[PDB]
Amino acid sequence: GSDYSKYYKTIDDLKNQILNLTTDNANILLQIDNARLAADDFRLKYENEVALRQSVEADINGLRRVLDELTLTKADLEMQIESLTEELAYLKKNHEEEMKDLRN
């Protein structure tokens, strides 16, 4: 019958609509899955980054403390060297003068 033919048309339209919807939704699910893996991958890479940066920065702070210590030490040594240099020169010239005196 004709009416039955119309109903048939609607049936097939719904069948194909199913097929299309299942395929589309499957593709979207794959997009979601791959995007998941990408987010997780980026979080691992990031974690590695914060680890490397952690070691670097800590080492930096340690090296700041060291540098300050070394500069203070340098200044101190310069002072001491100055004093001992004056003292040595005095010693040498004084002994030589005493030699001159006793020889005269």
């Binding site: 039955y4 609607t10 199913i18 940066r53 070394l70 030490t73 240099t85 002994h95």
Partner: protein
């Protein structure tokens, strides 16, 4: 004709399946939007932490060079100082001995 409700039932089933699949699609759209948004957020975090790390590494290089130089200067200065002290002491003893040498040698 008798068989209209058979067709209407089967159509109803197909309609139900379709409607469920459309709802599912809407949900999947939202879910993918959330996920993509996350991928962008974590990507950005990752890259920014790359740059922060790199600047930290460069800074470390600089400060470690400065430390190496400072250590070399400390080493050399300490050596010079030690030399000065040792020579002072030696010359002190030796010179006192020269004074003795002279007072006795004159005789």
């Amino acid at each position: 004709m008798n068989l209209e409700p058979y067709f209407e039932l089967f159509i109803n089933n197909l309609r139900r399946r379709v409607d469920q699949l459309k709802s599912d699609q809407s949900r999947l759209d939202s879910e993918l939007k959330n996920m993509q948004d996350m991928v962008e957020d974590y990507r950005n975090k990752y890259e920014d932490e790359i740059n922060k790390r790199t600047n930290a590494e460069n800074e470390f290089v600089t400060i470690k060079k400065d430390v190496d130089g400072a250590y070399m200067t400390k080493v050399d200065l300490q050596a010079k100082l030690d030399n000065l002290q040792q020579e002072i002491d030696f010359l002190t003893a030796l010179y006192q001995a020269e004074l003795s040498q002279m007072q006795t040698q004159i005789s």
